[model samples]
Target: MVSKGEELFTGVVPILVELDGDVNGHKFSVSGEGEGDATYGKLTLKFICTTGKLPVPWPTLLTTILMCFARYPDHMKQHDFFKSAMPEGYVQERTIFFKDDGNYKTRAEVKFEGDTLVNRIELKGIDFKEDGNILGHKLEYNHDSHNVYIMADKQKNGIKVNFKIRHNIEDGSVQLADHYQQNTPIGDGPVLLPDNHYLSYQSALSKDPNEKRDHMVLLEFVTAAGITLGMDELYK
Candidate 1:
């Protein structure tokens, strides 16, 4: 992070995410073992379906901004981009990286227009404003587990679409399909943690779900790439 003179302040972290929804009659999934870090002022990563199955916002600009707060509390409290996150205001540029045959694959800015924060989710070139504002952002932390939690919360009309981002920092284990597995041995390898996990709804959630999912697949980038592409430092 240029913020730290390209100095090493933390370790490599892994993000474990669980996304569940009412779509397809209530579904849930998980992913493990992807590199992550938020030492500087942001959370950047390169992730994939290590679980072999994934959610919609596994990686996206929306998720990235959410995870930034979960992973690095100090930095996000003063984030330049979202410093103006007004409760009843408007988003400057309204954009979304929809699973599109549209060009803007990753990194889309969502707009909070009007007084009520009226929601409008964009994908490809289409817009979905079918319901009220179900997608809300509120960052929370679990003191006992040392996990950070936030949500791109949205679920309605048989279309269960939502995400839960977690920055897990506890030394513990997780129950898998048939066995109980422990957190990766954080002995070496830069502590790739603040596992920025994104749990989203998938499996025919949209007309172009795969295209929307690819929205995340395309954006799997690491922030150490620069303080928002400044060429100062990388997440390596």
Candidate 2:
């Protein structure tokens, strides 16, 4: 008894936020609907910070800068240290989705910067595995909004990082549109510290087996907004 509109948003989107300290890890959770048509959702993340606080106090501009550097460390050498000092830790966030058929999904936006350099990363097409398991996932990067979409190739038993640089800060403004699709999933997976600590989704599993147990950290719900109807609005 699921409506055509309700079937689009519901599933788990795993996220990974990398930081400089020994604290870093990944978390998994669902995003979508709850009771009635209230449009409420949850974002369960994990990260280690100097204050052990959720939604780490770092500015969005700074966090966005660090995010770029973490994914592309080699490129940082060409940039100034003050702009690409890298982040000591990262705060993770994701949108909730739920299908009328009893399934769910998660979506998130990630960014990092080094000095004046900025990068934005996105995750989509997610499907959860059985009983707390995660599967069928992908990753993408938008290098300063060049309008050209570069897709990443999946690796054996995991995902791969695909990057393309086409624009600079001097380029015009880049507007991000929100759109969702039926049977589609979104969001980043697990935020990890340099040491691979569990900063969020303390309950989720890691693709890396060598990760330690003590380093795991799970973040709790901070705040939420928006309506839960079709994939179009969800992605929008």
Candidate 3:
């Protein structure tokens, strides 16, 4: 899975996802069109990589990442942290920081401010709370067995979700295309604090402890039991 030399850096970046919202206890639910949770659906995740090596083509890299998010129990909610989606104790404000190996630090915290269910990463100057509806926004790599899993644990209001997916990725020659989305120029990359993201290791986007860039692209995904969802943009 992991090697010591240059040609040995298999990096698996399993994608972890969380979706929570509360319009003052109005509650938010994620369902599938599978004849009432029949367990089936297509998941398409589109994301931009960093400005680095091309371990593989963009399409191929995306494919690998998508499958990682939809793998087994991680695709569902059977993990210990996520015993049930409707678990109790999600009615109050809570925050937890997950840091790993000085490389990735994921923050899966949610709070309620009156009529707003907020997703705040204030430590990194990020407060992405919505209209109390979908008021939210939200790691790792391992060698041996090439097992790399990213964990997503988000709880707020009437939702409690958690899961860790392992993607057997070594490394990639993939990245956001030059002139991304026909707007941004080439060699442009992303800089996000609490860099405990898949791209941190997968694409080396969050690996830099340097300075800033022009801007960044916000990536997200919505997955369900039967079907998965994503963006359908043509990147250049």
Task: List, residue by residue over 1-236, the lDDT tens digit for candidate 1.
Answer: 12321122245443332222221221323322233333433333232333333322332223322222122344333221221222221222223322211111122222222311222212222231222111111111121112222222112101111222232222342211111111121122121222222221111111224433232221222121112233645754
After superposition, which runs of candidate 1 have C-alpha atoms over 4 Å from their true positions? 1-9, 24-26, 39-66, 69-77, 80-219, 222-236
Model 2: how far is 204 from its true place, Å? Answer: 16
> Residue-wise lDDT of candidate 3 within 1-236, one digit each (tens)?
31211111112222222322222233232111101011221232223222323222222112122211222223333321211211110221223111221111123332223322222221111122332111221112221111222333222112222223232333432111110100111112221111112211122212223524221122323223322245567742
126 Cα displacement, candidate 3 (Å): 20
Ranking of predictions according to lDDT? 1, 2, 3
What are the per-residue Cα lDDT tens digits for candidate 2 across 1-236?
A: 43221122133333444433111122322121111111122333333332243221121111121112111122222221111222211222222221211121222233222211122223322233322211211111122221111121222111121222221112343222122211111223322112111111011212224633222322222111112244776677
The lDDT for every candidate, in the order shown, is 0.24, 0.22, 0.22
Q: Ten-residue segment with the worst summed lDDT in candidate 2? A: 193-202
Clash count, one per candidate: 17, 59, 13
**CA error at residue 62 for candidate 1, angstroms:** 8.6
lDDT of 1: 0.24
Instruction: Please tell me which predicted candidate would have the highest TM-score against the true structure.
Output: 1
Question: What TM-score would you give candidate 3 relative to the actual structure?
Answer: 0.21
- Write down the RMSD of all candidates, one decimal each: 19.7, 22.1, 21.3
Question: 94, model 3: CA deviation in Å?
Answer: 14
